[PDB]
Amino acid sequence: YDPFKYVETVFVVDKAMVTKYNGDLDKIKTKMYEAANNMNEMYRYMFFRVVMVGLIIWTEEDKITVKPDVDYTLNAFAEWRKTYLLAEKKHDNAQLITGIDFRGSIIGYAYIGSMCHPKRSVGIIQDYSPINLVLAVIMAHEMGHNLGIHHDDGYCYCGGYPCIMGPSISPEPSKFFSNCSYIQCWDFIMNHNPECIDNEPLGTDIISPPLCGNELLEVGEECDCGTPENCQNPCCDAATCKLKSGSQCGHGKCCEQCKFRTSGTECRASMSECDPAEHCTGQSSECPADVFHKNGEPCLDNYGYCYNGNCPIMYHQCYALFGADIYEAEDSCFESNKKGNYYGYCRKENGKKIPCASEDVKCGRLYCKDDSPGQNNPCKMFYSNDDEHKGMVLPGTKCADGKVCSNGHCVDVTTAY
Ligand SMILES: *[C@@H]1O[C@H](CO)[C@@H](O[C@@H]2O[C@H](CO)[C@@H](O)[C@H](O)[C@H]2NC(C)=O)[C@H](O)[C@H]1NC(C)=O
Ligand SMILES: [Ca+2]
Ligand SMILES: [Ca+2]
Ligand SMILES: [Ca+2]
Ligand SMILES: [Ca+2]
Ligand SMILES: [Ca+2]
Ligand SMILES: [Ca+2]
Ligand SMILES: [Ca+2]
Ligand SMILES: [Cl-]
Ligand SMILES: [Zn+2]
């Protein structure tokens, strides 16, 4: 079990910023590298890493309309990030850093509980102070909200210091999250499972200048276990980020007791028959990159087709939602998906619930035959306005012979992928 999470962050600097600093892009980049490193230190206490995988500076033009209206600007940045940035760069989170003055007293604005969401995993931050720590606190705070953390109240504690998630910025702010923030962060991890922050980024993914002792393995380093004081890695000389004599390795899934694990030691368990396991090579400290079998390949005694390492099937989705003895419902149940009502639809289009056509009914809301003693329901579904997508048939689910669900359509498996 890897205890740490990793937020792969792209930072976007607007034209107003460029202007504010008189076109001095080196000064801007350095401020951003420092800010990201301060964030990293803040988040460490919560078993989190903040990692700069991108730095975009809008010197020619802004790619959105940056407005004092934080709602317009948060949303405009969120849209661009989803449809343009996510297509050019693999990352978990994006922050906009602006030289403009937001309307009112606001210096930071971010969606709550959004980490990993294609659109909503973004924050916007006004460059409010030349003190790098102050700016880093605002950036940490807004990413806090992405992490389903709300503002500190009551007895939330982080030493004597002012905590990062206090609703107002402190004159002399600290690097410390509160106990409430830690709890809410990991409760959000538990509850909503943001899977994009699980992976440890490659050194070649990190675009900030390598720094020995930030606990991030970067280009030019053999190991990194943090500061000499915090280092609990016997393979690693903390000060120099060099392997100690005798050490073959000091990092990775295929490193044990400073030695390469032997050939064929499992380093990534197979999550299904569509996901081949990966094993240590013997000649490297790193588990090979994750391989899946081809999407659309028949699986689970011809009950499914492969979709990204899994075999999504109706019975298992009923099982996950409702428990051991719940089976696939009869075809008739799925006719409720023609309703276009609160639960009965195939997909959404700008928030509007689109009813299923006859050929697509099995790709909307899932229905299950529930024979629970005294609470029988032949067409049991799950609906909660907390997450309207929970209980919807999963992408890649077999909906007929030779057909899978794709965007709430039952489509030919051959041309689906
Ligand atoms: C985080 O820690 C602080 C201090 O450890 C907790 O506050 C204490 O608990 C009660 C409330 O249940 C206060 O009235 C006590 O006086 C506090 N003790 C102190 C200040 O020493 C706080 O409960 C914890 N917060 C959460 C949400 O877990
Ligand atoms: Ca890409
Ligand atoms: Ca203002
Ligand atoms: Ca990631
Ligand atoms: Ca490092
Ligand atoms: Ca695999
Ligand atoms: Ca039937
Ligand atoms: Ca359902
Ligand atoms: Cl109804
Ligand atoms: Zn806030």
Side-chain angles (χ1 to χ4, degrees):
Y1 177 60
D2 187 11
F4 292 87
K5 301 301 180 191
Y6 310 83
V7 191
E8 289 176 278
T9 319
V10 176
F11 302 96
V12 178
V13 170
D14 81 342
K15 184 53 189 194
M17 278 281 278
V18 174
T19 308
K20 180 183 183 165
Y21 291 91
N22 220 227
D24 195 331
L25 304 188
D26 184 73
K27 184 177 172 182
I28 288 178
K29 293 170 186 187
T30 301
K31 181 169 205 194
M32 294 318 291
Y33 303 144
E34 284 191 18
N37 184 242
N38 280 145
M39 288 172 81
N40 191 232
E41 277 306 288
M42 296 173 191
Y43 273 95
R44 190 179 61 74
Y45 296 99
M46 302 211 303
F47 294 89
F48 262 76
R49 277 76 163 85
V50 185
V51 183
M52 183 182 296
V53 296
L55 209 212
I56 296 166
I57 301 172
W58 287 341
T59 60
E60 293 302 317
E61 66 178 3
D62 289 331
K63 303 295 167 189
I64 58 160
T65 297
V66 190
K67 289 206 201 177
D69 179 9
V70 281
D71 280 287
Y72 177 95
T73 298
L74 179 62
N75 184 262
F77 183 69
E79 283 296 325
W80 170 88
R81 184 262 173 168
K82 174 178 186 298
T83 77
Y84 290 89
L85 180 58
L86 223 35
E88 283 297 326
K89 193 81 194 57
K90 169 204 155 193
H91 69 283
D92 308 339
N93 200 81
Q95 295 199 325
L96 177 73
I97 320 295
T98 187
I100 75 159
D101 194 25
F102 290 141
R103 219 161 300 158
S105 198
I106 169 162
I107 50 169
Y109 214 54
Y111 297 99
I112 297 171
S114 64
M115 190 66 261
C116 301
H117 188 99
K119 183 216 168 91
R120 263 111 68 181
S121 203
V122 298
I124 68 169
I125 291 92
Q126 175 182 329
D127 186 43
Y128 168 66
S129 169
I131 309 169
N132 194 96
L133 185 55
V134 177
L135 170 77
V137 166
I138 305 159
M139 293 163 70
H141 182 109
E142 298 313 330
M143 189 180 281
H145 288 308
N146 293 155
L147 258 19
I149 304 168
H150 296 87
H151 292 134
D152 282 358
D153 58 354
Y155 297 105
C156 302
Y157 181 76
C158 62
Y161 317 90
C163 315
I164 294 170
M165 298 306 284
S168 154
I169 191 84
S170 170
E172 187 201 309
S174 75
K175 299 189 191 68
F176 304 113
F177 280 101
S178 71
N179 58 347
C180 301
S181 293
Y182 181 71
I183 291 154
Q184 291 165 61
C185 184
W186 286 96
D187 200 59
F188 167 81
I189 303 292
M190 185 86 274
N191 295 350
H192 282 96
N193 188 220
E195 279 191 291
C196 82
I197 58 171
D198 280 342
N199 71 295
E200 181 181 358
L202 274 44
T204 46
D205 293 325
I206 309 174
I207 62 99
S208 60
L211 217 176
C212 176
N214 68 349
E215 290 179 18
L216 278 305
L217 190 60
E218 296 158 313
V219 180
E221 304 174 336
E222 291 174 347
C223 60
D224 190 315
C225 55
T227 67
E229 301 75 49
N230 298 344
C231 177
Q232 294 188 291
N233 194 158
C235 313
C236 189
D237 182 52
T240 52
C241 289
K242 291 284 184 170
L243 290 178
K244 289 175 165 173
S245 257
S247 281
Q248 294 168 20
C249 55
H251 181 273
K253 294 182 187 301
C254 291
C255 192
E256 215 187 75
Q257 308 283 286
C258 314
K259 277 178 280 307
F260 295 148
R261 293 207 177 179
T262 51
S263 212
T265 298
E266 206 180 71
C267 56
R268 197 184 293 96
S270 167
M271 58 184 173
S272 83
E273 54 179 58
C274 296
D275 176 19
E278 282 83 34
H279 307 78
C280 301
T281 73
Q283 286 187 328
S284 171
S285 73
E286 302 293 325
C287 192
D290 199 356
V291 173
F292 300 148
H293 291 320
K294 195 185 146 205
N295 284 180
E297 213 61 57
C299 54
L300 255 31
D301 302 350
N302 296 294
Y303 278 85
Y305 301 105
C306 288
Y307 177 78
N308 304 162
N310 295 305
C311 192
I313 66 151
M314 301 290 186
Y315 168 60
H316 290 176
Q317 292 165 49
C318 283
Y319 182 100
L321 283 165
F322 305 117
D325 287 283
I326 189 143
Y327 296 99
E328 302 183 57
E330 305 298 307
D331 288 345
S332 53
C333 297
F334 289 87
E335 293 294 295
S336 287
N337 286 335
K338 288 176 169 176
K339 283 167 178 157
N341 70 347
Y342 69 98
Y343 70 88
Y345 59 94
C346 254
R347 75 206 68 86
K348 286 176 158 165
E349 174 195 310
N350 296 149
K352 188 202 188 168
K353 288 160 175 182
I354 312 298
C356 299
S358 290
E359 73 173 314
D360 303 318
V361 290
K362 297 222 163 159
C363 293
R365 182 81 45 191
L366 174 71
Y367 301 93
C368 308
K369 190 177 170 72
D370 182 358
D371 289 311
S372 280
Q375 306 178 295
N376 286 209
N377 191 344
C379 306
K380 185 94 175 74
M381 58 84 194
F382 182 92
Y383 179 88
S384 167
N385 75 157
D386 185 70
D387 183 11
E388 291 187 315
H389 195 74
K390 186 179 161 168
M392 295 296 283
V393 169
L394 294 170
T397 305
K398 177 177 190 190
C399 43
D401 184 44
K403 310 192 85 191
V404 293
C405 296
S406 180
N407 186 45
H409 288 99
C410 191
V411 303
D412 182 35
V413 76
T414 312
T415 55
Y417 301 114

